[PDB]
């Protein structure tokens, strides 16, 4: 129920690793954002200097978040597709953090990964449909926007349109073709809600990586776990705390009992946790083999 029991022996990465290898920790949920893909060459929104909010000057937006809003997209799709061309990677290589989630899957620990990312890197690392909720959709497929058509197009097709600087139009009806992303103002997919309803009844650990927990309703997922479920944040800075004026993360107050912040690069935090678990060699070998295979494409 809603008791605040303390299941970690200490509020440290070391405590989390011990908990993970106890009989009580069977079901792990990962919640991830753009911070897990910055080291794969895709900027986030909020990192100073490198984040997209500091690099939209030449688009002359009323404000930086407009290029990611559905109202603006529907009026003028060209800016978005121009930015898509600028950001599109020549190679899709998942990070150490992505492969740490692949290990959770392979060790039988991963109940679900909920991602805010649209970059497909979770799929490339080996997470399947049983494993993954793409809360904000994906670039992997695209669809015609006309309700009477809705023809689907693969990423190879969308990539060619983006690089040619031709606004993508449907071959069957000549309507706009839109990547399967959830823009600000659009509804999330049905499975986000069905997974959320089921998964958070029975979660033993919540692992939050590379997110500022500022987009809703995704950010509210932290509050859906049972009150005794430990929560580990791996991130460059603390995030998810309740605002002093406005369930939230409590790392540091006198009443802290289950939330742990490991501050640094997601890749470094995952490597550190892997090492405590006895998984460091497995993670190293996995990453090197998968990266080598990607480099060989």
């Amino acid at each position: 129920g809603s008791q605040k029991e303390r299941l970690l022996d200490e509020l440290t990465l070391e405590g989390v690793a011990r908990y993970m290898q106890s009989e009580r920790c069977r079901r792990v949920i990962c919640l991830v954002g753009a911070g897990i893909s910055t080291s794969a060459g895709i900027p986030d929104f909020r990192s100073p200097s490198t984040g997209l909010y500091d690099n939209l000057e030449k688009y002359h937006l009323p404000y930086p978040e407009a290029i990611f809003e559905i109202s603006y997209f529907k009026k003028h799709p060209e800016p978005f597709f121009a930015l898509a061309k600028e950001l599109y990677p020549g190679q899709f290589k998942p990070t150490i953090c992505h492969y740490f989630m692949r290990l959770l899957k392979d060790k039988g620990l991963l109940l679900r990964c909920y991602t805010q990312n649209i970059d497909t890197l979770e799929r490339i690392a080996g997470l399947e449909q049983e494993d993954l909720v793409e809360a904000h959709g994906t670039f992997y497929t695209s669809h015609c926007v006309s309700a009477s058509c809705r023809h689907e197009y693969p990423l190879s097709w969308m990539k060619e349109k983006i690089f040619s600087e031709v606004t993508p139009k449907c071959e069957d009806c000549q309507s706009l073709v839109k990547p399967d992303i959830v823009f600000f103002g659009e509804s999330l997919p049905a499975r986000f809600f069905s997974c959320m309803q089921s998964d958070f009844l029975k979660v033993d650990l919540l692992l939050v990586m590379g997110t500022s927990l500022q987009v809703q309703p995704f950010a509210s997922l932290i509050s859906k776990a049972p009150l005794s479920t430990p929560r580990l944040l791996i991130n460059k800075e603390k995030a998810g705390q309740s605002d002093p004026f406005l369930g939230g993360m409590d790392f540091d107050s006198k009443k802290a009992y289950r939330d742990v912040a490991w501050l640094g690069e997601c890749d470094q935090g995952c490597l550190a946790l892997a090492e405590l678990l006895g998984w460091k060699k497995e993670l190293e070998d996995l990453v090197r083999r998968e990266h080598a295979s990607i480099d060989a494409q």
């Binding site: 600000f184 103002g185 659009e186 509804s187 999330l188 987009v215 809703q216 309703p217 995704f218």
Partner: peptide, 5 residues
């Protein structure tokens, strides 16, 4: 619900 900032 909808995606909001």
């Amino acid at each position: 619900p909808k995606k909001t900032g």
